[PDB]
Amino acid sequence: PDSWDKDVYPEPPRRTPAPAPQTSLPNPVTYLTKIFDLLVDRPVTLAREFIEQQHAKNRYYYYHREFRRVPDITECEEKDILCMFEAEMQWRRDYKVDQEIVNIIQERLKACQQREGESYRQNCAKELEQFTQVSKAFQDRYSDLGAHYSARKCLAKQKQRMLAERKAAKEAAAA
Amino acid sequence: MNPFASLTLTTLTILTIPIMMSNSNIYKTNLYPNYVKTTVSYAFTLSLVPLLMFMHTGQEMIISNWHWMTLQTVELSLSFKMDYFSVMFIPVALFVTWSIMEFSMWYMHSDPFINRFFKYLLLFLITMMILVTANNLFQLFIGWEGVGIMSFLLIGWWHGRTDANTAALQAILYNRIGDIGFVLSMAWFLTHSNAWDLQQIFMLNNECPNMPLIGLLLAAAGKSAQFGLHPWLPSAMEGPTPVSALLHSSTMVVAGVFLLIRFYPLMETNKLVQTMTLCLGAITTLFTALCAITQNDIKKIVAFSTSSQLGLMMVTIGINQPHLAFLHICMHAFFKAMLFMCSGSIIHSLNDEQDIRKMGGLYKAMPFTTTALIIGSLALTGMPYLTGFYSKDLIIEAVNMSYTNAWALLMTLIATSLTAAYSTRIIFFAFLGKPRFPPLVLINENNPLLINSIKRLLIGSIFAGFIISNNIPPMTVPNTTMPLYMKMTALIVTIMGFMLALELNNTTYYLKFKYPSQTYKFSNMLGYYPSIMHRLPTYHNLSMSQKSASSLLDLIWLETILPKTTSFIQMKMSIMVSNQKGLIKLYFLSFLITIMISMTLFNYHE
Amino acid sequence: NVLQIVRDHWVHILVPVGFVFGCYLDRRSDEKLTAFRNKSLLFKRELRPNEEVTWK
Amino acid sequence: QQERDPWYDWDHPDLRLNWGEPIHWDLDMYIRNRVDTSPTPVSWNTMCKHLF
Amino acid sequence: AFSAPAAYLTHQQKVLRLYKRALRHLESWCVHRDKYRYFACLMRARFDEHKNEKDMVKATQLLRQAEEEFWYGQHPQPYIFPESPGGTSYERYECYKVPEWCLDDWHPSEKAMYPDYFAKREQWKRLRRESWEREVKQLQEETPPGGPRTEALPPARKEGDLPPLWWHIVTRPRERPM
Amino acid sequence: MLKIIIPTTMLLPMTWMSKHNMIWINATVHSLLISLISLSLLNQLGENSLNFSLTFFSDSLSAPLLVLTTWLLPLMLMASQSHLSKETTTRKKLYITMLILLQLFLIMTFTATELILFYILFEATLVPTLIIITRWGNQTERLNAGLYFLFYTLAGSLPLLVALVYIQNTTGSLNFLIIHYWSHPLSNSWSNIFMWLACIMAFMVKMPLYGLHLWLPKAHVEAPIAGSMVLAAVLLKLGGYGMMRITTILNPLTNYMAYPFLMLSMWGMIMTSSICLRQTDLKSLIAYSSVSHMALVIVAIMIQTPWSFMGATALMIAHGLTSSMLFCLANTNYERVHSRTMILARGLQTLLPLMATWWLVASLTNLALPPSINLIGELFIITASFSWSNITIILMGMNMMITALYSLYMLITTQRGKYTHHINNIKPSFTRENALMALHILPLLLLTLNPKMILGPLY
Amino acid sequence: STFVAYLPDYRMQEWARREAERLVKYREANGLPLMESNCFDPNKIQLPEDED
Numbered sequence A: 001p002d003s004w005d006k007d008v009y010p011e012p013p014r015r016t017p018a019p020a021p022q023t024s025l026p027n028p029v030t031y032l033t034k035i036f037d038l039l040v041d042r043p044v045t046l047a048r049e050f051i052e053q054q055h056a057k058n059r060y061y062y063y064h065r066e067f068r069r070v071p072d073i074t075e076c077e078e079k080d081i082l083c084m085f086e087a088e089m090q091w092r093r094d095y096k097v098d099q100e101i102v103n104i105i106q107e108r109l110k111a112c113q114q115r116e117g118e119s120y121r122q123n124c125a126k127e128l129e130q131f132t133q134v135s136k137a138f139q140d141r142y143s144d145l146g147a148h149y150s151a152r153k154c155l156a157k158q159k160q161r162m163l164a165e166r167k168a169a170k171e172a173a174a175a
Numbered sequence B: 001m002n003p004f005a006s007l008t009l010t011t012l013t014i015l016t017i018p019i020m021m022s023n024s025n026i027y028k029t030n031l032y033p034n035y036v037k038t039t040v041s042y043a044f045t046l047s048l049v050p051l052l053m054f055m056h057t058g059q060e061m062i063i064s065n066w067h068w069m070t071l072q073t074v075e076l077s078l079s080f081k082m083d084y085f086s087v088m089f090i091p092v093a094l095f096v097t098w099s100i101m102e103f104s105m106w107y108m109h110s111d112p113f114i115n116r117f118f119k120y121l122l123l124f125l126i127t128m129m130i131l132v133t134a135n136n137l138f139q140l141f142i143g144w145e146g147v148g149i150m151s152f153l154l155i156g157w158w159h160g161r162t163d164a165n166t167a168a169l170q171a172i173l174y175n176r177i178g179d180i181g182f183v184l185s186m187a188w189f190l191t192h193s194n195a196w197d198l199q200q201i202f203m204l205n206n207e208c209p210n211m212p213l214i215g216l217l218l219a220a221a222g223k224s225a226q227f228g229l230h231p232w233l234p235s236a237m238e239g240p241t242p243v244s245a246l247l248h249s250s251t252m253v254v255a256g257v258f259l260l261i262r263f264y265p266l267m268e269t270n271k272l273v274q275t276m277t278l279c280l281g282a283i284t285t286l287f288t289a290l291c292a293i294t295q296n297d298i299k300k301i302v303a304f305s306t307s308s309q310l311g312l313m314m315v316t317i318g319i320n321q322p323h324l325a326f327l328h329i330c331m332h333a334f335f336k337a338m339l340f341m342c343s344g345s346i347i348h349s350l351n352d353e354q355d356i357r358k359m360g361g362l363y364k365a366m367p368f369t370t371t372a373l374i375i376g377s378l379a380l381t382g383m384p385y386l387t388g389f390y391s392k393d394l395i396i397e398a399v400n401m402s403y404t405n406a407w408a409l410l411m412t413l414i415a416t417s418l419t420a421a422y423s424t425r426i427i428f429f430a431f432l433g434k435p436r437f438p439p440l441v442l443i444n445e446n447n448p449l450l451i452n453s454i455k456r457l458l459i460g461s462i463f464a465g466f467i468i469s470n471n472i473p474p475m476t477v478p479n480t481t482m483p484l485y486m487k488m489t490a491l492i493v494t495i496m497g498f499m500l501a502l503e504l505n506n507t508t509y510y511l512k513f514k515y516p517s518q519t520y521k522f523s524n525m526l527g528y529y530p531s532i533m534h535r536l537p538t539y540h541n542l543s544m545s546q547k548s549a550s551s552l553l554d555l556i557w558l559e560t561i562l563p564k565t566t567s568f569i570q571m572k573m574s575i576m577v578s579n580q581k582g583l584i585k586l587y588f589l590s591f592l593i594t595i596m597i598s599m600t601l602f603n604y605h606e
Numbered sequence C: 001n002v003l004q005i006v007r008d009h010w011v012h013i014l015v016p017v018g019f020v021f022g023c024y025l026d027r028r029s030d031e032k033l034t035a036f037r038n039k040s041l042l043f044k045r046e047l048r049p050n051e052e053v054t055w056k
Numbered sequence D: 001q002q003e004r005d006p007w008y009d010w011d012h013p014d015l016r017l018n019w020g021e022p023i024h025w026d027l028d029m030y031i032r033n034r035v036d037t038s039p040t041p042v043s044w045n046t047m048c049k050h051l052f
Numbered sequence E: 001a002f003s004a005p006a007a008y009l010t011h012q013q014k015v016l017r018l019y020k021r022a023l024r025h026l027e028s029w030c031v032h033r034d035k036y037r038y039f040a041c042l043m044r045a046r047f048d049e050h051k052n053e054k055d056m057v058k059a060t061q062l063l064r065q066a067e068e069e070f071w072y073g074q075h076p077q078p079y080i081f082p083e084s085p086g087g088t089s090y091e092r093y094e095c096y097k098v099p100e101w102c103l104d105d106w107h108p109s110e111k112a113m114y115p116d117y118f119a120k121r122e123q124w125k126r127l128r129r130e131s132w133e134r135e136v137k138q139l140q141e142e143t144p145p146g147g148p149r150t151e152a153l154p155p156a157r158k159e160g161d162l163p164p165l166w167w168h169i170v171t172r173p174r175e176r177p178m
Numbered sequence F: 001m002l003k004i005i006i007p008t009t010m011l012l013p014m015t016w017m018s019k020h021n022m023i024w025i026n027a028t029v030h031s032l033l034i035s036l037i038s039l040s041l042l043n044q045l046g047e048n049s050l051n052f053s054l055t056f057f058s059d060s061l062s063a064p065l066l067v068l069t070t071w072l073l074p075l076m077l078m079a080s081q082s083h084l085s086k087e088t089t090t091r092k093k094l095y096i097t098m099l100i101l102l103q104l105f106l107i108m109t110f111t112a113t114e115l116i117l118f119y120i121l122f123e124a125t126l127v128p129t130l131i132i133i134t135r136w137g138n139q140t141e142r143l144n145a146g147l148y149f150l151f152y153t154l155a156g157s158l159p160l161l162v163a164l165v166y167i168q169n170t171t172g173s174l175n176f177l178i179i180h181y182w183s184h185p186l187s188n189s190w191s192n193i194f195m196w197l198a199c200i201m202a203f204m205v206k207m208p209l210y211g212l213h214l215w216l217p218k219a220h221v222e223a224p225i226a227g228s229m230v231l232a233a234v235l236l237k238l239g240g241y242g243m244m245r246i247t248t249i250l251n252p253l254t255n256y257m258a259y260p261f262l263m264l265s266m267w268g269m270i271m272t273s274s275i276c277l278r279q280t281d282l283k284s285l286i287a288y289s290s291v292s293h294m295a296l297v298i299v300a301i302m303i304q305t306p307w308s309f310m311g312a313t314a315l316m317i318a319h320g321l322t323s324s325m326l327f328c329l330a331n332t333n334y335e336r337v338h339s340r341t342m343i344l345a346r347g348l349q350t351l352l353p354l355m356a357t358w359w360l361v362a363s364l365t366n367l368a369l370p371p372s373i374n375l376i377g378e379l380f381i382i383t384a385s386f387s388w389s390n391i392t393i394i395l396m397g398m399n400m401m402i403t404a405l406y407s408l409y410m411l412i413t414t415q416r417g418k419y420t421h422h423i424n425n426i427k428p429s430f431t432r433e434n435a436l437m438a439l440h441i442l443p444l445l446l447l448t449l450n451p452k453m454i455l456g457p458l459y
Numbered sequence G: 001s002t003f004v005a006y007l008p009d010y011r012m013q014e015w016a017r018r019e020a021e022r023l024v025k026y027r028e029a030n031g032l033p034l035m036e037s038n039c040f041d042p043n044k045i046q047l048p049e050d051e052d
């Protein structure tokens, strides 16, 4: 339905064929579907309608909490404990958000594989490359930090990678 | 909403209602087994409908209804896979369980704990359904261990019997040997694919390496009782006959084959693992068929038949024919359950006797049982247009027309001979000839429960092959062009087995006696595998566990090094320090020595 | 009638009173760490027209 | 314990032991739920050759 | 099972036991009744061939050779009666056997049901308590000073005496207790 | 945090002012109430810990341990009151006082912010346990067991004190927050190697590590039932908690300083699982199984991965509950027959069916049947080890097989077969024993529905 | 158990999911990469000037 955003969780237009009977024999699945409808789907719908009627009389709201952007660990001096603490909290929040992003991409990949059936190897290449890109980024950001991780160790890993890349680029410039 | 998901989940849900009522009053009455049987029958007739929906439109679904926990990037959810395999296997298992519980209502009538027996059967059914419908590896492991533990509890039903406890522990040991490989596969998949669910694993493993597939193969060999870990299935016959008919014949022992079928997209991308599976299946089926033809206990013969059929499922997996293997599972369930049911009726009629040497002429004394067993034996041997034809003969045809190991093909053919061989042995020794049982005849098969259940499985064993084969889409490319002699290979092999086994069985009427050959001794004693492997490794392991780990290290050397050395050293030093004679002469001499040292070794150093 | 039962069952108030006293002391301990109240760069806020503190 | 007489009237029938008798050092290894040393119809070191 | 064992088996007892084992294993080999009967009469004839031997040494050597022949030619899977120590139903009903002393721990509401049974059990308990001392005295009387030599027990010899050590033999639970 | 500590202290005058026939009732009721109050600490913030004050804080690691301790106290009281019926009122009050003091020291130990306070309470836990073992133990070997338990602990703990005061002198603080935020790498030097050893060996011997585990069978077998319950359930976890707290400052040295400890833990878990197969005493088997589980926990802590810490926390909680249940189950039979030999009483399922059901469930949880939290922790640790090295799976699978083997061996030996004939004093199970088993087992199964409560901070 | 089951979401998992949804929508609505290999901005990092 409209509860979740259709851009974060997209799906194809859901093309379905029309029934084209070829025999005079009656279809038992259609009769069973009608029986199931009349015996299950209508009482459930009525119960849900009553439940929604009761819910409408009591409407209240809950809000999504917004967090300001505080300075990160790069702009904290060596022994400033308060700035370090706030930067570490922000970094942990960002780590959780990145984990959830990877989770969303993985959900997309799983949905594509189930939906495409026998042609998943061809019709899920875009989801696969999206997951490859996000996985590489997440690995570069957070892998091998180990337990007792921190924003300082992430910064050290990033700086080591930057130094290696800069040395490689400089040595390629002389080639 | 689409009724498919609701019906598939309701079929699984309603099976747990008697488990919830197990604490209610109905569990204390004698109406509980009938209640459980009726619940299972209702579950079967409900599961029939999603099968019709799939047979019409090929509807498949996955339901991630409940989120359990999320570890970082990995999400664990209660998810059910409702593809062709689930929607086809659920009704067959429910049908077989319904028949077997109706049989148990008669077979286990005098058991004082019949309610507990039916509850255990229902728990096993629930765990097998969980195993079959699982979409991720954690849920499948839950079903794995649930059916394993239920098998342990049902094998040792008569817990006052030492051999039952021994067999249950043996089954647990072998299943955990396979579980080692299961856990290895799980760890590899989580570490390299970041998922336990089937969909992610398929997407991220285009070229599957050897480690996860070898782990899965080890798990399947453990669960399906292949040659390395075979002996526990024949020893599982310690349990009551319904347990052997349901768990260790047709439903639980196919779990390894089903696990390998669940991962066939990864299996078809690796040829080494396929070759290993094919070779293991071939050696298993031929070894078990060779062991079967010399056994005198009917349940042992049928259990070895089950093991040989499992080996056949492994070989048809090895030639990259997973759908054919699933079809074989579904087909074999019917007549193998029927064969155990007939054996149990025979056993109950002849005062709990299982040796075929004391089973005389029951062809006339037990007409319905004889007819059912003959039909089941013809289905097992691949008689055309029966249940066993549509799968076994296609399996032989596909094995013949594939780039396959020659030895595996030859061993499959010899096992096909031996199948008819031991079927002829069973029929000849159990139903023909003169009576050999004690004179007081208690033969009576005039009970509606037994007749109705065996009748239902007989109708299944007659028509299910045709109906199911004609009511599914083509998932395998047919072999249309083959040489005529090679088309008839299975039938020639079966007829040769029939003729030669019948000849050797007819020769025992002669008044001539000869000592057994060494090959007969090898076949009858199961190749001496339980004689050596159950005695040498166990003795060595327990002997090292006591002599070395317990006594040599913990009780002797770890004691010697840290605590006993400390105690000895402190005692010696205390004795040295405190044993003074109390004479001031010696003390003041030592005082002079100390003064001389302090003034020289210390007072000169500043 | 209540004198004797009080004298033999008065011990059942010690633990609830200890719990209440512990909560009270926890609030007092919270009262000593208000140096950065409404002072963090992440949660610094403008007071409502009638409120005196952001938390207590 | 599997080699002991099963028709004797043992004090402990399952255990196949008598009260007050000396107990083997490795009884828990030989409880007959476990390692069995009973004689076999075919000689040891002959079954090994055939199996191997 | 019921008889006190002797210090040793005589040559005659060993000979009969070997005869019975050979007959049973031959029946295992000879499935059919007529062929088994034929070969059993042949076995009986071969066994009676040395029936009247007087030299004990040659009889012992014949017994040893016969035992070797039996061991080489025994059936690897001989027929076993279901309730026999090797049968498929050997200890099947052991889990249903509950000792009689458990009935003393029953709740009085449980004993409200089945009143006559418990009255008769009280009668049996009084009988045992009133016979135990006489049983002990008789066992002390009829025993050599150097302790008993065999596991045999004497019967009752007086008017109202019961055989010593009878409670746990008479009060066996059952062979099919449930 | 005072709302938990103060009622625990109030438990002392309340039980010292109670009537001679009301001490058990009052102590059990108020211990259950305190456990209910302590259950409120499971609400964790995620990013950081709950810092109540300068002295105490709560973490996602500390909260399950605190709840386990508070829940274990009433079970200890329920198990104790049967074998202490003949005791005088003063001595029963002293026993309950020992239990309350142990609870207070444990709850303060898991929440201290600073390492010297943690060390002081972690050593203070010794005295009540020693008094319980050496005063209310049943056999004559309790004195030797207490000496082993005391000196094995202290020989490891004193170097930890020296290392802690040296570290505070060099860094200027030992507060865990400052320790974590100002962490600097440990160089490769002999001084740093010995600092690592002094910071590690105390928690090693409290686990216990294989080779330093000889005190555990003695102490756990020779202690009364409550002493064994608290030794297995809670006191073994002090080493693991200390390791998780202390390895923050030990990097990057742990990368190679952990090799001998990993080797010892894996091979010794194999050795202790094998030892359990040949054991004539029922309590020693449970003790050695505890040793194997704690060896697996040691491996998980040593490898330093988030999945490893999550699995270690889950395994600690699950092992505590399961080991306490198994010890209580053994104690019931010991009270029946007054002997610890496993083969003395056989076929107890025929006489005690519900206790046999409790035995079966405890044995199933001991072998980590899915989807119990025992297997959750074990599987997480095994996956982390596989990431560490693919060859660890051989030892993990061998340990799983042997664990299933001795668990079912114990179950079959104690419950199956035929009953011993001459033993005729096996009375029906009391309501107290069945209730104790149920109160052990039900939280275990309920934790399966919400596994994230015991997975720890790395979740 | 009821109290623990109905514990408020202080762990910020629903909040994290909503934040991730917002970030993903914003990033693929503009063609930006879903995640950067750099956790911190290279412009506020001052590496050592010379590497040789």
Ligand SMILES: CCCCCCCCCCCCCCCCCC(=O)OC[C@H](COP(=O)([O-])OCC(O)COP(=O)([O-])OC[C@@H](COC(=O)CCCCCCCCCCCCCCCCC)OC(=O)CCCCCCCCCCCCCCCCC)OC(=O)CCCCCCCCCCCCCCCCC
Pocket: B290, B293, B294, B410, B413, B414, B417, B418, B421, B422, B425, B493, B496, B497, B500, B501, B504, B505, B508, B515, B516, B517, B519, B520, B523
């Ligand atoms: C054109 C193509 C078409 C081909 C058509 C056919 C082709 C030729 C077929 C001929 C092949 C086998 C024929 C029958 C065999 C037995 C007949 C017989 O003579 O009986 C007497 C005797 C049976 O013993 P007994 O003393 O009479 O029994 C005592 C009482 O009677 C006990 O009585 P009881 O009451 O206990 O019960 C009796 C029971 C028990 O009877 C037994 O004891 C027999 C058990 C073993 C024999 C069963 C044969 C299966 C052999 C499979 C081996 C595969 C390779 C394994 C390699 C092992 C390596 C060590 O008998 C039965 O009920 C049924 C038994 C078997 C019947 C069905 C057999 C047919 C299947 C095999 C042929 C396949 C046909 C189609 C071909 C498919 C592919 C082209 O047999 C023997 O003494 C020898 C048997 C020969 C087995 C050889 C195994 C092959 C591999 C050997 C090793 C090779 C390597 C060299 C050594 C290593 C060097 C390093």
Ligand SMILES: CCCCCCCCCCCCCCCCC[C@@H](O)O[C@H](CO[C@H](O)CCCCCCCCCCCCCCC)COP(=O)(O)OCC[N+](C)(C)C
Pocket: F188, F189, F190, F193, F210, F211, F212, F257, F260, F261
């Ligand atoms: C029963 C269980 C008890 C508990 C078990 C505790 C285990 C403690 C073992 C500690 C693990 C290793 C300790 C130190 C790591 C390396 C040790 C050494 O062998 O490595 C070499 C060291 O070289 C030499 O081997 C020096 C050590 C030789 C003297 C030590 C004696 C070892 C004999 C074994 C005695 C048993 C000890 C335990 C008693 C119970 C490395 O060469 P190098 O790179 O140059 O030196 C690195 C150090 N630097 C950086 C400061 C220079």
Ligand SMILES: CCCCCCCCCCCCCCCCC[C@@H](O)O[C@H](CO[C@H](O)CCCCCCCCCCCCCCC)COP(=O)(O)OCC[N+](C)(C)C
Pocket: B019, B020, B021, B022, B023, F039, F064, F065, F067, F068, F071, F317, F443, F446, F447, F449, F450, F454, G001, G004, G005, G006
């Ligand atoms: C004997 C007779 C037996 C037969 C009778 C059996 C009857 C049926 C039995 C089967 C019942 C199956 C129940 C299946 C679960 C249904 C309810 C479940 O979904 O709720 C769970 C709730 O589980 C609890 O949250 C976790 C259990 C907490 C356990 C605490 C125990 C109390 C402490 C005791 C001491 C512990 C000591 C050790 C602690 C470390 C999961 O919650 P969640 O899906 O998320 O909630 C979604 C909606 N919310 C979030 C808004 C609530």
Ligand SMILES: CCCCCCCC/C=C/CCCCCCCC(=O)OC[C@H](COP(=O)(O)OCCN)OC(=O)CCCCCCC/C=C/CCCCCCCC
Pocket: B163, B166, B167, B169, B170, B171, B173, B177, B180, B217, B218, B221, B226, B227, B228, B229, B235, B280, B530, B533, B534, B535, B537, B538, B541, B542, D032, D033, D034, D035, D036, F397, F398, F405
């Ligand atoms: C990969 C890791 C595991 C590999 C295997 C390592 C060896 C395992 C050693 C296990 C030792 C456990 C001993 C403790 C058990 C207690 C004693 C015991 O079980 O008794 C033996 C008991 C009784 O014997 P019965 O003959 O059935 O008695 C019936 C009439 N009385 O039977 C048993 O359970 C013994 C089981 C021993 C299994 C050991 C052999 C297993 C070898 C497997 C190798 C093949 C691998 C499979 C290859 C698959 C292809 C990929």
Ligand SMILES: CCCCCCCC/C=C\CCCCCCCC(=O)O[C@H](COC(=O)CCCCCCC/C=C/CCCCCCCC)COP(=O)(O)OCCN
Pocket: F151, F152, F153, F154, F155, F156, F159, F162, F163, F166, F190, F191, F192, F194, F195, F197, F198, F199, F201, F202, F205, F212
């Ligand atoms: C019950 C069994 C448990 C046994 C556990 C015992 C092992 C404890 C670990 C070693 C204990 C001593 C550690 C000392 C405290 C560390 C403080 C520290 O780091 O200071 C070092 C000092 O390092 C030392 O002096 C260590 C020397 C060792 C003294 C005692 C040796 C006894 C045996 C040691 C090996 C055994 C330890 C492990 C064995 C475990 C149990 C078998 C460097 O300081 P500086 O002098 O300032 O150097 C830098 C500026 N130049």
